[PDB]
Structure formats: C-alpha cells, structure tokens
C-alpha cells in the first residue's frame, strides 16, 4: 500500500531561560525513526528505529549539521514573527512545521506537503500543486512574498519529488521487516455496571500494526457510531497500537450487541460479544 515520510518540527521560545527549544521528529508511516532535541546534553540527530543502524556515520553527521542550521533559522524566525505580529519579547511562542511526502505501492509520488503554524494557528502552506503558497494572515503574506522572490517553491518541490521520495524508498527497503509487517489485533470486551440499570460495554483492540483500524458496535445489524465513545488510536510503547470503543446498553440485553474489528491483519473482520 502507500507509505509516508514525515517530519514534525517545533521551535518554542522561553524568554528569560535561554535559547528556544528546538525539536525535529521523523516518521516513516506510523513508526518514529529519527529525532533531534536541542535540550539534550550533546544535541545530535539520533536513530529511533532499529533499522536505522544501517546508515553510516556520515548520515548522522550530515543530519546533525542540518538540524543545527535549522535550529538557528527558527530562532531568527521567532524574532521575526514578534515583529510581524507586534508582540513583546517576554512571552513564549511556538512555530510548528509538518513536511513530507507519500508514495504509492510502486514507490512513485502521490503527494507532498509542507504546512506551518504560529501559536497553534495556520500560518503558511504549500498548495497541492507544489508551486504556490497559501497564507492565513497578513504576516504570512510577508513570508509568501519573500519565498516567491527567493524561488523557494522550486527548491521545496525538488526536495519533495527527489530527496524525500528517494530516501523514503530507501527507508522502506532497509526497514522492511518492521515497516512492511502486519501485526493482527487481538480483541476483547469488558463490562461495567452503571446506575439506572444500564451497562457499559467496551471493546478493546490490542497489539496491532499498522495503526489504521476500524472498531464499531452493532445492534440488529446497524452500526451505532452515534452512541459510541472511543479514544483515538494510540501507541503502546513497542511499535504497536491500541484502541477501544464503548457503548451503553440496557442491563440484560448485552448479548444483542456485537463489536466489529476491521484491520489489514484480519482477513475476515472480528465479531465479538460480551
């Protein structure tokens, strides 16, 4: 199926407490694989997945140098934005960026993206065409105009179509045992009493990879998406994921409700009941 390479970048100022904190975290699909954190003792780009042991020392040196340069660029950017928004030097502010690319099963580009936010709100983004930008406010419009005269979209497009795609293919090759695997969910239902002669039924799905999964509850063949409570799919500490979804049903009628689990590792979806 399709696969992605994404980098999540954050710069956070802290006036009165030194330089901003700067972090970069890389993912292939749902799997964290590299990280840089300025608050570490000796800041360096570091592997976060076992398969990244396959890169040589030059990889780490080059990525570290790039991250240090980026850290300095974002420190300047925090100052620049104080000017654009007419803000004081005493408050903390945050810049966030998501950058990456997605390829199909055949390794060819499906889409590329780059989106920025300031203090948790949209700032500037690359359009799907990979040629133009969209700016959320007048400050971002200043950035847009700078980037247009510097030929930035051409540079970014070259990265998205070239480097990003080529390295993603390499990571998928090197990390195939991890990245191309399927770990099937194991499911179970728990039961909890409530006041008013009702019961909560909670369907759990554990130990699965990749992260995409669907959990539903049904009654008489119809899904109960409206009445369901759930949590977002979440990582479980070892590279697998988990999720739960619950419904409140009348006491004594639990046997009429079924949980359904759909996943890449389930040739036939699971059907369970309390």
């Amino acid at each position: 199926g399709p696969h992605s390479l994404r980098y999540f970048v954050t710069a956070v100022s802290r006036p009165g407490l030194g330089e901003p904190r700067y972090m970069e975290v890389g993912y292939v699909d749902d799997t964290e694989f590299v990280r840089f954190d300025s608050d570490a003792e000796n800041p360096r780009y570091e592997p976060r997945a076992r398969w990244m042991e396959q890169e040589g020392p030059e990889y780490w040196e080059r990525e570290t140098q790039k991250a240090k340069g980026n850290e300095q660029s974002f420190r300047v950017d925090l100052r620049t934005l104080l000017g654009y928004y007419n803000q004081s030097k005493g408050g903390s502010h945050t810049i966030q960026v998501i950058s990456g690319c997605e390829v199909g099963s055949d390794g060819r580009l499906l889409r590329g993206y780059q989106q920025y936010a300031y203090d948790g709100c949209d700032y500037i983004a690359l359009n799907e065409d990979l040629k133009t930008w969209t700016a959320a406010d007048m400050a971002a419009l200043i950035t847009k105009h700078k980037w247009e005269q510097a030929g930035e979209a051409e540079r970014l497009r070259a990265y998205l179509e070239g480097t990003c795609v080529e390295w993603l293919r390499r990571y998928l090759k090197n990390g195939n045992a991890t990245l191309l695997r399927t770990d099937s969910p194991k499911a179970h239902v728990t039961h909890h009493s409530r006041p008013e002669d009702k019961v909560t039924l909670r369907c759990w799905a554990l130990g699965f990879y990749p992260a995409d999964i669907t959990l539903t509850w049904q009654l008489n063949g119809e899904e109960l998406i409206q009445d369901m409570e759930l949590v977002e799919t979440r990582p479980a500490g070892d590279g697998t994921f988990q999720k739960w979804a619950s419904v409140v049903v009348p006491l004594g009628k639990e046997q009429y409700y079924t949980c359904h689990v759909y996943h890449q590792g389930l040739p036939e979806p699971l059907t369970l009941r309390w």
Binding site: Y7, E63, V76, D77, T80, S99
Partner: peptide, 8 residues
C-alpha cells in the same frame, strides 16, 4: 532525510 528550512 529532512529539509533545510527557509527563513520566514
């Protein structure tokens, strides 16, 4: 491999 970001 990550990108070398452009200043704002």
């Amino acid at each position: 491999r990550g990108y070398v970001y452009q200043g704002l």
